[PDB]
RNA sequence: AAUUGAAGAGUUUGAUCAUGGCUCAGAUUGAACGCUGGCGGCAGGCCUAACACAUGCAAGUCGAACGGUAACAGGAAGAAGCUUGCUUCUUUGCUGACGAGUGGCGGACGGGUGAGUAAUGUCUGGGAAACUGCCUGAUGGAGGGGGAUAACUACUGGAAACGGUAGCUAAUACCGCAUAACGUCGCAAGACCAAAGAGGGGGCCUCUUGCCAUCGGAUGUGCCCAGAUGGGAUUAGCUAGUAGGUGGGGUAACGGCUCACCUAGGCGACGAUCCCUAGCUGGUCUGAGAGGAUGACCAGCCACACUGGAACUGAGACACGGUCCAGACUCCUACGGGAGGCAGCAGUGGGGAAUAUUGCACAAUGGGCGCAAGCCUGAUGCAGCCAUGCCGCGUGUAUGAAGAAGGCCUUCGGGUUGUAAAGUACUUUCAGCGGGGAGGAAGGGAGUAAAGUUAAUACCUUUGCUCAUUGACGUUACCCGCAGAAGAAGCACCGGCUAACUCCGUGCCAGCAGCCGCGGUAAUACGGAGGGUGCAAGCGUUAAUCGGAAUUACUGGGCGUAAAGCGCACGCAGGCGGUUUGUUAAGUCAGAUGUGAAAUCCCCGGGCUCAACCUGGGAACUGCAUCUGAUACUGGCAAG
């Protein structure tokens, strides 16, 4: 129900940084990021169009740490919701509580944010929520519980987030360890490297 | 019967069957008297038998042995037959 | 006869009652004539945990329908017991 | 109004009874073509007024025999 | 706001285009099997033998209808050891009560199953000739008598089951009589028809409740019609109560429902009859849709209750745990004769690829009886078992080059498994252990005060007010502490389709395989390994449905040569119909009204920490009927 294996294999297969490490070091100094894993990694056998769609889907899944059944349900919800299906899917993924905890800088990675959520360190609107997939809505306040404010993990994670592009759809107070989900991100707020139409097409087959 | 109330019900409905059968035989006998008098051609005897029967069918309808519609049917049929006779 | 009673819906350990008008011989969750409200015994604060169509209820009552004890208590409570 | 049906007498060989073919124009549920469909009704004809070929207006009534639950209203146009 | 909706690929050939079948990728399930398996929430769980069933339980209740008193728990009248307290007494329907019995109501519900049924069913919409316990509105009545009969007693028959005889006794059991219309019959005059008491209180009265009649309501049910609802024409004729009429009978009611007579009809290529199969619907799965497939759970309708048949009682049954008969089977027997029906809930055997506990509780909701208290309730609420599904979560999180050891490959340089381990620093969800602790408990019972009733401060009824209490689940949800990464990862695949490649082992063998195919020494296709890919507490396989299949083509295909124009023609039924005017308003179109159950789907919200689940309003239910309009087109009619 969670991927527990080596992390940089996933990035190396996707051929890009999935941000599955804290980012204290460059991912180059920890692995051969330009080479796919395994004995025949250096090879680069032509990828079919199906392969391209599959790899895009897997890359987004692995960024956010979502298994296939949950991800498929996300696609179904995005298709049901009014508007652009791929943008809806990205918005749903960004709304996850573990992802929001990471985006506010409380967790060094999304897996650390997930553990913070799971281990009951996170409050949404003053109430403990330990569900990683909980959907945060606009104007919600996400805070570190008082018992967890002394954790060195969280201070280090806030330091790390200081050295990333700050999301504009959130408002974090690193002193009180509180953040506000102002609005759902638009597509411009998310990376232009994600090609979500490929995921939509994959699931529409 | 396996259930106590079912055994009591069987006894009670047998008792009622005997009671009802006696009453129903009596009422049918009086109706048949009216019909026999009609067939013989005797109006006066037919009317006398009808006057005997009428309270009986009315009372048996009041007691639920027959529906009041059935008593009304017997009265109407016999009256129509008796009147169309002379 | 015609009764006004509670049909037990919802989920296990979390009952939700529909207030129905029914021939009393029918099953509790079966055939009914008209639904005239609901009662949520575990409704949260700010939630409307009871709604009754008192006009329809009075129409059926002035027409011979009896009222179960729970529904009678609910009618009294909609009128501030 | 009174609900009525109009149709062609196809048999009058019964005493006080006739058979009336009622015609309806219905769209086919699959192909969409409007097609003609016939309903045959045993109708009570007191006075034996109707002949084979007349067009009669009929109406529904209580059962009068095993197969009769319709009665004559009038002959709209005679044969 | 509530229709954001539509992908192909492989394979015929030396190659090509087309045609065309086969096959695959998807989604789904009451699944089963193999490998594996941590937790929880919610749901689901005999699809086969409508096979046979051990055992327990699934329908009672009312003493406020009645005679009563078996038992008890006492209040009285009379009684023995030997603790000066005391049993033990013995009696007594006096009292609370209550076994058996009469009586009332229930047992027609609830629950099960899908055998039968292709239309006495079901669905949608109309309808007329009906009955309807309990509930409810109105108006009146509610007098005065009688004969019994259980129980009980005595005797008596039978192994038993079950009876027989005689004598007592009661009623809200039963039956006359009276009374008798706005009831029934009758054109009318007339004639005729009912009933029951019981409880609480009181200086017979009053209150409550029950009883009878009639007409209403409501609910339920019976009946009728039209359209719809599988397959087969290598089933084309079927039918004599048959079709209709008249009269009698019959039913709650119309009706060949039945009978007598008369007429000779009735059904059928718009598919009758016959044969095969089948419970129907809301819906469910699939699909862009139109369709196709389907009817498990949930809800509506129907049918059935060992098999065949029958009626009785009753408001209601031709009656799952009633009666009678017959049959098969099982059992008891003293051999004469008797007993039984899990397709209620558990459960057993059996059949099967396969489907669970002989559990807890009436606390809640509902049902029966009761004035109530309450009793009953395998309905139901829960619990148990099972990864059967859906959903959620965990199995750690940082950091870590020594790019360690081993494995594997190697062109012998190295590459890879690799930040993966280890090491270091953290976090404790869930599981374990301790403590804390909601909500589903609304009522009901006692007193109390007012009314509101009366002769009455009384009974009783409504309100408030006080008291003490009511939870099966249950060691509940949930919350807080404790210890420590500890207790938690597998399954399929890697020739193309199709994401994922190499070495050794084998040598047309062993074997694989959905299709195309692979294997005969240099196999990414067999087998093991290393590496990898996809899913993940599951993963695969099989079965089965729709999709892809525009491959039955309505949407949406073809027929010169690929399969396909009858050898040719005439022609009935049928389909179709030049042009103008009038009329009609059937089709068609517009609006409205009724209906289209709820659930489900969809949209918007709301509740469970989220989700699944639950849930409030909407939309939708594309249909049908009716009414009112429109008149271009189609149809009818009239004139050209
Ligand atoms: Mg899961
Ligand atoms: Mg008929
Ligand atoms: Mg009586
Ligand atoms: Mg009298
Ligand atoms: Mg069958
Ligand atoms: Mg299609
Ligand atoms: Mg079907
Ligand atoms: Mg009867
Ligand atoms: Mg029964
Ligand atoms: Mg049984
Ligand atoms: Mg059973
Ligand atoms: Mg077996
Ligand atoms: Mg019992
Ligand atoms: Mg409580
Ligand atoms: Mg490939
Ligand atoms: Mg080899
Ligand atoms: Mg098709
Ligand atoms: Mg073709
Ligand atoms: Mg040829
Ligand atoms: Mg040819
Ligand atoms: Mg030719
Ligand atoms: Mg010709
Ligand atoms: Mg024309
Ligand atoms: Mg019209
Ligand atoms: Mg609906
Ligand atoms: Mg919410
Ligand atoms: Mg809704
Ligand atoms: Mg015209």
From Swiss-Prot, chain A:
Protein name: Small ribosomal subunit protein uS4
Domain (S4 RNA-binding) ranges: 95-155
Known partners and oligomeric status: Part of the 30S ribosomal subunit. Contacts protein S5. With proteins S3 and S5 encircles the mRNA as it enters the ribosome, which may play a role in mRNA helicase processivity. Some nascent polypeptide chains are able to cross-link to this protein in situ. The rRNA transcription and antitermination complex (rrnTAC) consists of RNAP, NusA, NusB, NusE (rpsJ), NusG, SubB, ribosomal protein S4, DNA and precursor rRNA; S4 is more flexible than other subunits.
SMART domains noted in UniProt: Ribosomal_S4, S4
Top-level taxon of the source organism: Bacteria
Keyword Transcription regulation in record: yes
Alphabetical UniProt keywords: Antibiotic resistance, Repressor, Ribonucleoprotein, Ribosomal protein, Ribosome biogenesis, RNA-binding, rRNA-binding, Transcription, Transcription antitermination, Transcription regulation, Transcription termination, Translation regulation
HAMAP family reported for this sequence: Ribosomal_uS4_B
One Gene Ontology MF term: structural constituent of ribosome
A cellular-component GO term for this protein: cytoplasm
Family: Belongs to the universal ribosomal protein uS4 family.
Function in brief: One of two assembly initiator proteins for the 30S subunit, it binds directly to 16S rRNA where it nucleates assembly of the body of the 30S subunit. With S5 and S12 plays an important role in translational accuracy; many suppressors of streptomycin-dependent mutants of protein S12 are found in this protein, some but not all of which decrease translational accuracy (ram, ribosomal ambiguity mutations).
GO annotation terms (biological process): cytoplasmic translation; DNA-templated transcription termination; maintenance of translational fidelity; negative regulation of translational initiation; response to antibiotic; ribosomal small subunit assembly; ribosomal small subunit biogenesis; transcription antitermination
A Pfam family per the record: Ribosomal_S4
Alphabetized InterPro entries for the sequence: Ribosomal_uS4, Ribosomal_uS4_bac-type, Ribosomal_uS4_CS, Ribosomal_uS4_N, S4_RNA-bd, S4_RNA-bd_sf
Lineage, top ranks: Bacteria, Pseudomonadati, Pseudomonadota, Gammaproteobacteria, Enterobacterales
Protein source organism: Escherichia coli (strain K12)
């Amino acid at each position: 129900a969670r991927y527990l294996g080596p992390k940089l294999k996933l990035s190396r297969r996707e051929g890009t940084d999935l941000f599955l490490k804290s980012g204290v070091r460059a991912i180059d100094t920890k692995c051969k990021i330009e080479q796919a894993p395994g004995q025949h990694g250096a090879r680069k056998p032509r990828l079919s169009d199906y392969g391209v769609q599959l790899r895009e889907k897997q890359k987004v899944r692995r960024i956010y740490g979502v298994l296939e059944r949950q991800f498929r349900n996300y696609y179904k919800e995005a298709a049901r919701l009014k508007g652009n299906t791929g943008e809806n899917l990205l918005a749903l993924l960004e709304g996850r509580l573990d992802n929001v905890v990471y985006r506010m800088g409380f967790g060094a990675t999304r897996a650390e944010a997930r553990q913070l959520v799971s281990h009951k360190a996170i409050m949404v609107n003053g109430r403990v929520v330990n569900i990683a997939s909980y959907q945060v809505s606009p104007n919600d306040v996400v805070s570190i519980r008082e018992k967890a404010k002394k954790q060195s993990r969280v201070k280090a994670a806030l330091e790390l987030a200081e050295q990333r592009e700050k999301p504009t759809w959130l408002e974090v107070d690193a002193g009180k360890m509180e953040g506000t989900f102002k609005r759902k991100p638009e597509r411009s707020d998310l990376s232009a490297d994600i090609n979500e139409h490929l995921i939509v097409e994959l699931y529409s087959k | 019967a396996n259930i106590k109330s079912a055994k009591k019900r069987a006894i009670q409905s047998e008792k009622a069957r005997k009671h009802n059968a006696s009453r129903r035989s009596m009422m049918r006998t009086f109706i048949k008297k009216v019909y026999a008098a009609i067939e013989a051609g005797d109006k006066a005897a037919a009317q006398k038998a009808f006057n005997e029967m009428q309270p009986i069918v009315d009372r048996q309808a009041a007691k639920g042995l027959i529906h009041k519609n059935k008593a009304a049917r017997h009265k109407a049929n016999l009256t129509a037959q008796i009147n169309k006779l002379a | 006869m015609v009764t006004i009673r509670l049909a037990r819906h919802g989920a296990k350990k979390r009952p939700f009652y529909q207030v129905v008008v029914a021939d009393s011989r029918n099953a509790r969750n079966g055939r009914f004539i008209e639904r005239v409200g609901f009662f949520n015994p575990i409704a949260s604060e700010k939630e409307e945990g009871t709604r009754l169509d008192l006009d329809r209820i009075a129409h059926w009552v002035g027409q011979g329908a009896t009222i179960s004890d729970r529904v009678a208590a609910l009618i009294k409570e909609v009128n501030k017991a | 109004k009174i609900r009525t049906l109009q149709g062609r007498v196809v048999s009058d060989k019964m005493e006080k009874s006739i058979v009336v073919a009622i015609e309806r124009f219905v769209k086919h549920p699959i192909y969409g073509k409007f097609i003609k469909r016939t309903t045959k009704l045993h109708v009570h004809d007191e006075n034996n007024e109707c002949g084979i070929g007349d067009v009669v207006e009929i109406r529904e009534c209580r059962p009068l025999s095993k197969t009769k639950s319709w009665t004559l209203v009038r002959v709209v146009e005679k044969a």
